[PDB]
Each structure stands twice: as C-alpha cells, then as structure tokens.
Amino acid sequence: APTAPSIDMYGSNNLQFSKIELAMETTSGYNDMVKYHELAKIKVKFNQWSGTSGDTYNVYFDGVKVATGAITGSQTTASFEYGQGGLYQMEIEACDATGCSKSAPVEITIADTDGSHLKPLTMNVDPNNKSYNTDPSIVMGTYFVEWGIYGRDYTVDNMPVDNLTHILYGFIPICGPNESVKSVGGNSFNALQTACRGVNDYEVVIHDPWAAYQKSFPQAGHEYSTPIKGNYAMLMALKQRNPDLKIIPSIGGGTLSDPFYDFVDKKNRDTFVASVKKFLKTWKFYDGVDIDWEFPGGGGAAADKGDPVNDGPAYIALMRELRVMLDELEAETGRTYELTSAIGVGYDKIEDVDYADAVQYMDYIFAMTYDFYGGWNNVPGHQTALYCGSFMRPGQCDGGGVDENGEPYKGPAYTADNGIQLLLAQGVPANKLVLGTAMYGRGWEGVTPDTLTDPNDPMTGTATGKLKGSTAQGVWEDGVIDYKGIKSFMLGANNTGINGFEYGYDAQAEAPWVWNRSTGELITFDDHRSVLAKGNYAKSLGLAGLFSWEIDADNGDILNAMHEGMA
Ligand SMILES: S=C=Nc1ccc2oc(C3=NCCN3)cc2c1
Numbered sequence: 413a414p415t416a417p418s419i420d421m422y423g424s425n426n427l428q429f430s431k432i433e434l435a436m437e438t439t440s441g442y443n444d445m446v447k448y449h450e451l452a453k454i455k456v457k458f459n460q461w462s463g464t465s466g467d468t469y470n471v472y473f474d475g476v477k478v479a480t481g482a483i484t485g486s487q488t489t490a491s492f493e494y495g496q497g498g499l500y501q502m503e504i505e506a507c508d509a510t511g512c513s514k515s516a517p518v519e520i521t522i523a524d525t526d527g528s529h530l531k532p533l534t535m536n537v538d539p540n541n542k543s544y545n546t547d548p549s550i551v552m553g554t555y556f557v558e559w560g561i562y563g564r565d566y567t568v569d570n571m572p573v574d575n576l577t578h579i580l581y582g583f584i585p586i587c588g589p590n591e592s593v594k595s596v597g598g599n600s601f602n603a604l605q606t607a608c609r610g611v612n613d614y615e616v617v618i619h620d621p622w623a624a625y626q627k628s629f630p631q632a633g634h635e636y637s638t639p640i641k642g643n644y645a646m647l648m649a650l651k652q653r654n655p656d657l658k659i660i661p662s663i664g665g666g667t668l669s670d671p672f673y674d675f676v677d678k679k680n681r682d683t684f685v686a687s688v689k690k691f692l693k694t695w696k697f698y699d700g701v702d703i704d705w706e707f708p709g710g711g712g713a714a715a716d717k718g719d720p721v722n723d724g725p726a727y728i729a730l731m732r733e734l735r736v737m738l739d740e741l742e743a744e745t746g747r748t749y750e751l752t753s754a755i756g757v758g759y760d761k762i763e764d765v766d767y768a769d770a771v772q773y774m775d776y777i778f779a780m781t782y783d784f785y786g787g788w789n790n791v792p793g794h795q796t797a798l799y800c801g802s803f804m805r806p807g808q809c810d811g812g813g814v815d816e817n818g819e820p821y822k823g824p825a826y827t828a829d830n831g832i833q834l835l836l837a838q839g840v841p842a843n844k845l846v847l848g849t850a851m852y853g854r855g856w857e858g859v860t861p862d863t864l865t866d867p868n869d870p871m872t873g874t875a876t877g878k879l880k881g882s883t884a885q886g887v888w889e890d891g892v893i894d895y896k897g898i899k900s901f902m903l904g905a906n907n908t909g910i911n912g913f914e915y916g917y918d919a920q921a922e923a924p925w926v927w928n929r930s931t932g933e934l935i936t937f938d939d940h941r942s943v944l945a946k947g948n949y950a951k952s953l954g955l956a957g958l959f960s961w962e963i964d965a966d967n968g969d970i971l972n973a974m975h976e977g978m979a
C-alpha cells in the first residue's frame with residue numbers, strides 16, 4: 413500500500429559507488445587523494461511523490477537484502493555499506509503494516525580496483541602487430557610508461573596485449589631524497605613533492621594521479637561519474653579481457669632511485685615494504701612488484717650515492733622482506749604475486765650484488781641489456797649488442813688488455829652476452845633471466861668520416877655531442893629516438909636508408925646502425941635481425957624469455973621480431 417520508490421539517479425551520484433575513494437579535481441598528497449575502504453559507502457536517494465510513504469525501506473541487490481532503515485518523508489536517503497565490487501540489480505522496497513512496494517530494478521555500480529565492475533577493454537592496436545602462437549611458458553614483457561599518454565599519445569588500449577605475458581608499469585616513485593628527479597627539469601620533481609606531502613619518507617606514491625586515475629578516456633567509456641578513470645581503470649578493464657596477463661608496478665627507475673640508497677637502514681625498508689603491501693591492497697589489478705634500483709653500489713643518476721659494501725646485502729634483504737610480505741598477500745587473497753627486478757648488467761654493476769643469493773626470492777630478473785653506449789659521452793658503441801663488436805680494441809671484449817693510453821681495461825666490455833655470462837657464473841639460473849631488447853636508439857652528432865679509424869665502421873669514430881631532433885621524428889630527449897621514428901625517418905620502408913642515412917649491421921656484435929655521413933648523425937638500436945639473434949641466444953641458453961623498453965616507441969616490428977626469434 414505505500415507508493416513504490418523512484419530512485420533519484422542524479423541525487424545518488426548516478427548509482428556509481430566505490431570501494432576506493434579518489435580525488436578527481438585536485439592534485440595533492442597521496443594519502444589525501446586515495447583512500448581504500450573495506451566496505452563501499454552507498455548513498456541512495458529515492459522519492460515517493462504521491463500517496464503514502466510507509467514507515468520502513470529495504471534494499472536488495474540481485475534479490476538479496478542488504479540494508480533497511482526508516483522512511484520518514486516523501487524523500488529518503490538510504491546510506492549503508494557493502495563489501496563486494498560489481499554490477500548489481502538494485503530494488504528498493506517501501507513497507508508499512510499492510511504491505512510492501514518494490515521499485516523497478518536499476519543497475520548499481522560498485523567499483524573495485526580488480527576491475528570487477530568493468531567490461532573487457534576495447535582494443536585499438538596498430539594492425540602491424542601480428543598474431544603468434546608463442547609458448548605460454550616464455551616471458552614476453554614490456555614497459556608501459558605512465559607519461560606515454562601525453563605527447564607520445566599512446567594509451568593502454570594501443571598495447572598489443574595478446575603478444576605479452578607481462579606489462580611493467582613505469583614508474584612508481586618513493587618519497588624521500590630525490591635530488592636526481594630535480595636534475596631532470598620539468599614538473600617532475602614538483603609533482604613528486606606534491607604527492608609526498610603528508611606522506612612518510614620511503615613510502616611509495618603515485619607520481620601522476622591525472623594519468624593514473626583522473627584522466628577520462630572516451631575509448632574506455634569513462635564519463636563524469638566513473639569512480640576510477642585514467643591508466644589504472646583501463647588496466648583494470650585490460651585484466652578483465654586478459655586475466656592471465658601479469659601487470660606489475662615498477663618502482664624506482666633511472667631518476668627515481670635515490671631513496672633506495674637508504675635501504676641500508678632496515679626501518680626504511682620496513683616502511684617501504686609495508687607501503688608496497690598497502691599499495692597492492694589498494695590497487696588490486698597489480699600482480700606483484702618490480703624493483704628498479706639503479707644501482708646498488710652506485711654509478712647511477714646520483715653521483716654522490718652508492719655503497720658497494722652495503723647496497724648489495726641491502727638489496728638481498730629487501731628482496732627477502734618483499735617476498736615475505738608477498739607470501740602474506742598470497743595467504744589472504746588466494747592469488748599468486750610475482751617479485752621481479754630490472755638490473756644493470758655492466759660487470760661493475762653485477763659485481764656489487766650477490767644475485768644468486770637475491771634471485772632465490774624472485775620470480776625473474778629483467779636484465780637491462782641496453783644503454784651500453786649513448787649520448788652521455790662522445791664515444792660511439794652498440795647500445796644493445798649481444799656480442800663484442802668489430803670496433804673494440806684487442807683484449808677489450810673480455811677486459812684482458814689495454815686502451816689508447818695503455819691503461820688496463822677494468823672488466824669485460826658492456827655487451828648483453830658478457831652480462832648474461834656474469835650472472836650465470838654467480839649461479840643465477842638461466843630460467844630466471846629475461847633478456848632485454850631496446851625499442852629505441854641512442855645517438856650522436858658529428859661522427860663524420862674524418863673521425864673514423866676504420867673507414868667502414870662509424871663505431872670507430874668520435875662524436876661532437878648527442879643526437880638532436882624533434883618529437884615529430886620521435887626524439888623526446890637529446891640522444892634518444894623511438895624505434896618507430898628510426899623506421900619512419902631514417903630507414904624507410906625498404907630498410908635501405910633515407911634522408912641521408914645508411915643502414916649498417918655489425919654481424920660480429922649482432923647490432924644495426926644508421927649513419928648520415930654529412931651531419932655525422934649515428935644511431936645505435938635494435939632491429940628485426942638483432943632481435944632474432946637475441947631470441948636465438950635466449951633459446952640457446954634456456955633464458956626465461958625477452959622483454960623490451962618501452963612499448964609506445966615500437967611500431968609492431970620489435971615485438972613481432974621478439975616472437976619470431978623465440979619460435
Ligand atoms: S635515466 C638516467 N640515468 C643516468 C643519469 C646520469 C648518470 O650519471 C651516471 C654516472 N656514471 C659515472 C658517474 N655518474 C650514470 C647515470 C645514469
């Protein structure tokens with residue numbers, strides 16, 4: 413006999429509710445912006461405009477009763493709490509002593525960060541990415557960078573997810589000392605200062621909440637009331653489409669590694685470890701953690717930092733304490749959590765960590781088998797070669813000899829193979845090692861013929877400085893160029909060379925280059941041929957697979973070649 417309630421859809425936040433509460437119109441400290449709740453707070457306004465209102469209401473989701481309260485007027489606000497994310501058919505019933513009247517059913521959304529309230533993501537992948545039937549046991553990883561969504565214009569739905577087992581999401585910073593972030597310029601340190609207000613030193617934070625959970629993406633169907641937007645909501649819809657895809661946050665990275673050096677203090681580690689646990693409880697679509705400490709012992713962005721006695725033991729203690737915390741998350745949730753880590757592979761980086769000790773705690777080690785040479789100095793080299801190139805001096809490859817002063821080589825030359833070998837010799841199992849491919853080149857200006865010691869090898873010349881170019885040609889910073897930029901603007905469709913560039917390949921190193929004799933522009937990179945050699949090298953040794961850095965810079969060719977070389 414009471415009038416059936418009508419739901420005030422707009423008075424009820426359009427029936428979009430959430431276990432996670434996120435600031436949408438603000439940029440502030442992480443703890444101010446992100447609050448995870450065990451139970452979602454649901455607030456539903458309903459009206460009874462004509463007839464009698466009755467005295468009590470009940471709320472049903474999919475026929476189960478989940479709340480009751482008093483009706484006292486022609487307008488009621490039902491507030492209550494609910495613990496499971498998902499879409500539900502909601503009915504509200506108004507009751508009196510003579511009977512009850514149900515509202516017609518209406519869909520209520522309760523978001524959770526596993527994406528249970530979302531449809532599978534809709535893909536928009538360059539069709540230049542082919543299909544493969546690569547053994548599901550082989551690792552095919554890549555990094556997807558948070559800021560890729562700006563100028564580079566590359567979003568989660570552009571990733572060829574069917575050709576990937578692991579997405580590493582770069583990068584999650586740590587609060588605390590971060591001078592190295594400052595040195596980068598832009599808003600980057602400022603944004604980190606903001607994110608860290610009200611947050612303890614050594615805890616993880618989201619760097620760019622706009623890219624991560626605020627930015628509305630039409631292709632994902634985000635609209636004003638959607639409680640989770642940005643890269644994270646798309647990666648949640650992505651997990652719905654490909655539930656076996658591992659998505660892993662990458663913590664640290666080149667410029668974000670300054671706080672790792674205070675991990676020689678166990679309090680700092682405990683703080684960090686506990687913030688990582690909270691982070692994974694907050695963002696349930698993530699499947700583990702990746703530590704990119706560049707680098708234990710030093711030799712990274714922070715010139716004033718690095719302890720070669722203590723950093724290694726701290727790294728190993730860190731991996732153990734992470735795996736302990738991850739064991740508890742597996743306990744509480746029933747899921748498998750992965751612990752991985754990207755590492756430098758120069759002899760001088762390797763010798764500072766007992767990796768055989770650390771790896772027992774870990775699922776994989778992403779060997780950063782790139783950046784061997786680059787625009788930081790005027791010495792050309794293959795940045796991502798497998799083997800020693802022709803340009804190397806006698807005894808340089810193994811570090812047995814002397815340079816042009818007659819100064820002794822301190823250790824084996826920087827090559828992929830030399831790195832993998834050093835890790836195998838320490839006792840790291842082959843099947844935990846993932847070998848890295850570059851989706852970009854590094855480059856130089858001013859390596860003209862008059863500089864060569866061998867007239868057919870520009871790797872024997874001398875540079876004037878870093879390669880300069882525009883973002884239109886894929887140069888996002890000095891000395892670095894996207895692979896798709898090399899292909900469009902230097903190689904051309906036939907891989908023969910265009911705009912003054914020639915294509916060369918060092919068969920001994922397994923490394924391509926492009927060279928413009930007159931500007932002396934020289935770019936070292938990975939192409940189809942050398943990725944095939946890497947896949948072959950990986951098969952040969954029983955390596956876990958391949959990964960790449962970074963996915964937005966590929967046109968399809970590098971990832972394709974990754975799958976082909978593993979076949
Ligand atoms: S991303 C960034 N990565 C960087 C940025 C600057 C850097 O400087 C060194 C260095 N090597 C010897 C003394 N200092 C490494 C290094 C890595």
Ligand SMILES: S=C=Nc1ccc2oc(C3=NCCN3)cc2c1
Pocket residue numbers: 666783786788789892
């Ligand atoms: S992006 C870029 N990343 C890198 C990666 C490795 C690097 O090494 C140096 C260096 N500086 C003096 C001797 N070596 C700079 C540098 C920048």
